[PDB]
């Protein structure tokens, strides 16, 4: 803010963010990216953390190969996690009847909750890899885009405590609402 010309001044106005988010009648799912790698998505009560690397922790032979949201009930004991996972996959674009399925764990297994999707840019699943890349770009402002075109690349989502330093941005929330169709926000 300084004098420009002879009687005119140049000054700026910045809009608050915490008030708008805490003031909405419903609860909004918010996306965040901390440091330069750690992606985060917080729904109602699911504070999911997303990372990318070429580590295969799940295998098709011994797992649950989720193809439909009905089978998702066999993974977690809490409905909020199921809602968050299903709607995130719907928002990125995963129409469940024409696409490869994705792998999760049986709930009775004593190894927590986790879901992972392979998006390696190889011959097979190349189209799925590009579609997921576009979805990630649209759903995250400055996408780091790890696991460049090479041997392997698998994304993993796990439940962690929500960190109290994420910049509560709202562009990503708007894109999540726009891409996600028929998303029902509670409260």
């Amino acid at each position, epitope marked *: 803010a300084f004098k420009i010309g002879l009687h005119t001044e140049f000054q700026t106005v910045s809009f608050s963010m915490v008030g708008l988010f805490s003031n909405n009648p419903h609860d909004l799912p918010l996306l965040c990216t901390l440091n330069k790698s750690h992606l985060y998505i917080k729904g109602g009560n699911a504070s999911f953390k997303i*990372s990318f690397d070429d*580590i*295969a*922790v*799940l*295998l098709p*032979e*011994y797992d649950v190969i989720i193809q439909h949201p009905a089978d998702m009930s066999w993974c977690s*004991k809490s409905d909020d996690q199921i809602w968050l996972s299903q709607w995130f996959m719907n928002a990125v674009g995963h129409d469940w009847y024409l696409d490869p399925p994705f792998l999760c764990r049986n*709930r*009775t*297994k*004593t*190894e*927590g909750f*986790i879901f992972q999707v392979n998006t390696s840019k190889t011959g097979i699943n190349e189209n799925y890899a590009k579609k997921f890349k576009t979805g990630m770009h649209h759903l995250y402002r400055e996408y780091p885009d790890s696991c460049l075109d090479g041997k392997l690349c698998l994304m*993993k989502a*796990q439940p962690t405590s929500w960190p109290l330093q994420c910049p509560l941005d709202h562009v990503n929330t708007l894109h999540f609402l726009t891409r996600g169709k028929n998303i029902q926000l509670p409260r």
Partner: antibody
Framework: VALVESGGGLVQPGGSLKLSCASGASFSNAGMSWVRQTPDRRLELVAAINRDGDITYHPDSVKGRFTISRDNAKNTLYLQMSSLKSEDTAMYYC???????????????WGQGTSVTVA | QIVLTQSPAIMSASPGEKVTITCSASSIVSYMHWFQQKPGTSPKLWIYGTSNLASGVPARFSGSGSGTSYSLTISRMEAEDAATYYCQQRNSYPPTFGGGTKLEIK
């Protein structure tokens, strides 16, 4: 972190046992397990208890005879197992279990263990 | 029901050498862990993730794997390296261990 065990010894082939196993770590944020080592050096997992005692698992070789329950207030574990058999004479270890690596859930701090004998 | 076969059962190396331990599976396994044990004691975790060293292992131990076959490697071993090693996989319940390998120093 330290772990102690008690309740082992010699028992007739057909009795029932209650083995007791923690200190140092709050242990309310860890999932634990019990494993067997036969007189020949061979290992096998027999009990696995989730951080919350809501989920508890045992394999076929102990299904219907081995149960494990943790007293969080005392930071202890009681494993009750009936129908003693000769093949179930071995060393028993109670071991912690935590995440080492963003996705790896592996056993930690295997205890001293106690001897169970059938004769 | 994944089974694990270790090779070889008995080792007798030289006071400072490079040794390898082979661990094959019945079916494909993604990740594998290695545990170490001394006589008259309890096993201690040594390698996790087939590539991650344990908290307090000298920088001469390493691991690798592919599909069904995994390997453990010691570059320059000393007398302290004489003990028993166990494979472990936790992909399909029940989690299964190896048959155990004993390594001794000549």
């Amino acid at each position: 972190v330290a772990l102690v065990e008690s309740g082992g010894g010699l028992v007739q082939p057909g009795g029932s046992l209650k083995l007791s196993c923690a200190s140092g770590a709050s242990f309310s944020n860890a999932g634990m397990s019990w494993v067997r080592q036969t007189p020949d050096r061979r290992l096998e997992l027999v009990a696995a208890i989730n951080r919350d005692g809501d989920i508890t698992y045992h394999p076929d070789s102990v299904k219907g005879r081995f149960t494990i329950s943790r007293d969080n207030a005392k930071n202890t574990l009681y494993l009750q197992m009936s129908s003693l058999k000769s093949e179930d004479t071995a060393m028993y270890y109670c071991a912690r279990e935590d995440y080492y690596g963003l996705y790896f859930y592996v056993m930690d701090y295997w205890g001293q263990g106690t001897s169970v004998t059938v004769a | 029901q994944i089974v694990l076969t270790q090779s070889p059962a008995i080792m007798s190396a030289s006071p400072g050498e490079k040794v390898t331990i082979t661990c094959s599976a019945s079916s494909i396994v993604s990740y594998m862990h290695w545990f170490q044990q001394k006589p008259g004691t309890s096993p201690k975790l040594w390698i996790y993730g087939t590539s991650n060293l344990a908290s307090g292992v000298p920088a001469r131990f390493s691991g690798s794997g592919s599909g069904t076959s995994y390997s453990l490697t010691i570059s320059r071993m000393e007398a302290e390296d004489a003990a028993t090693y166990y494979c472990q996989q936790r992909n399909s319940y029940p989690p299964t261990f190896g048959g155990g390998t004993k390594l001794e120093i000549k």
